[PDB]
Amino acid sequence: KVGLLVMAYGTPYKDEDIERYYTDIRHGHKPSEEMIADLRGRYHAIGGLSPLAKITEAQAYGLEKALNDSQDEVEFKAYIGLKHIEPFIEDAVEAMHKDGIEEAISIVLAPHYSSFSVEAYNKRAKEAADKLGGPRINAINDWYKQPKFIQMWADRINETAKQIPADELLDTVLIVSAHSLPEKIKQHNDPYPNQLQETADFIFEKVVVPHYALGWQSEGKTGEPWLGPDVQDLTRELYGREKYKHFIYTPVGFVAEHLEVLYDNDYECKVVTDEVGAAYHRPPMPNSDPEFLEVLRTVVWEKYSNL
Ligand SMILES: CC1=C(CCC(=O)O)c2cc3nc(cc4[nH]c(cc5[nH]c(cc1n2)c(C)c5CCC(=O)O)c(CCC(=O)O)c4C)C(CCC(=O)O)=C3C
Ligand SMILES: [Cl-]
Ligand SMILES: [Fe+2]
């Protein structure tokens, strides 16, 4: 009945895909052999390829089932629309149209909104809808305010923090982060940095960890300022000022274990904590955990109810 357009970045299915994938990320402008080798190396450092493709499938169809098992007002049919590899956003909308789906709710697998992320997802999805003639795309822009989302993260952080000696929890700090973007989005009151601060604040309101700070990660290869501080620079800064013994990294901008977590956090950030002599913690990402599917099920239903 109702189309469930679940959108995410996408990831190379094969080592042979890294090239066209990176090209699509660079809006067609093919990267150099050096850029490709750096990216391929990062993928190999996390075991070869990312599990994002399978986690994304599990989230998309785990969400479809969660919605369908919880009510019978409508039947949701989930179509996956990736940003930089097939099936693309336009392919998903094409499938919805050919399948007779005339109404759909779209959600990005990223809780926060920004001109670079969700807006691009929604523009492409809605423009594909306009051209094909359907379906009608009712887009969710953000859902970080979903109480179950905040609680999910607080629980994970609390699960980890209660593994920290009480006499060292005062020396523990929570690093909330998301994918960095060009700092210029802050010049036009882009909500992204604020949604992250709000998310960090909400989660801090509900965890035992007494210290927290908002960082950014995965800044791109460009020649303009990107949002900071970077989680690595932040870790250094915080150890210098407070000598924290435990760093709990929650890249709440992401919803799955993928390259931007398995490398930029589990490697690059751990390198810094190893350096300063502090402990590294990175709670499990939501992936397709039942409570996260419940978060998405709640977000999508509240959206449908408001249609
Ligand atoms: C806001 C945002 C999200 C969060 C929202 C969302 O989920 O959409 C996100 C997620 C992801 N980004 C990812 C991967 C990459 N992003 C890149 C590059 C870039 N991302 C950007 C932005 C974002 N990205 C930007 C503005 C660039 C620079 C483009 C340019 O300079 O032209 C590059 C190129 C190399 C590099 O710059 O590091 C890669 C490989 C993966 C998949 C990881 C895997 O494969 O497991 C995921 C989930
Ligand atoms: Cl992008
Ligand atoms: Fe990206």
Numbering used by the authors: 4 to 310
Article sentences:
Understanding structure–function relationships of key enzymes, such as ferrochelatase, is an essential precondition for the design of new inhibitors for antibiotic‐resistant pathogens, like Listeria monocytogenes. LmCpfC crystals in complex with cpIII were soaked with a ferrous iron solution and flash‐vitrified after 2, 3, and 4 min, to obtain snapshots of the enzymatic reaction during iron insertion into the porphyrin macrocycle.
Ring A with the substituent p2 exhibits the highest distortion in the “34% Fe” structure (+12.6°), +9.2° in the cpIII structure and lowered values for the “24% Fe” (+4.8°), and the “68% Fe” (+1.9°) structures; in ring B (p4) the angle is altered the most in the analyzed samples (−13.4°, −10.5°, −11.4°, and −6.7°) as a function of the site occupancy by Fe ions, exhibiting a high degree of distortion compared to the coproheme structure. The measured change of angles throughout the ferrous iron insertion process at the site of p7 at pyrrole ring D is also peculiar: the rings in the substrate‐ and product‐bound states overlap well for all structures besides the “24% Fe” structure (−2.1° in the cpIII‐structure, −1.6° in the "68% Fe" structure, and −1.4° in the "34% Fe" structure). Interestingly, in the “24% Fe” structure ring D is significantly more tilted (−4.2°). In the “24% iron occupancy” and in the coproheme‐bound structures, the guanidinium group points toward p7, while in the “68% iron occupancy” structure, being in a split conformation, partially points outwards since one conformation is 5.4 Å from p7. The residue points toward p7 in the “24% Fe”, “34% Fe”, and in the coproheme‐complex structures, but points away (5.4 Å) in the “68% Fe” structure. Nevertheless, a definitive conclusion cannot be drawn as the ionic radius of the ferrous iron in the “24% Fe”, “34% Fe”, and “68% Fe” structures is larger than the ionic radius of the ferric ion in the coproheme product and would result in an out‐of‐plane position regardless of the side from which it is approaching.
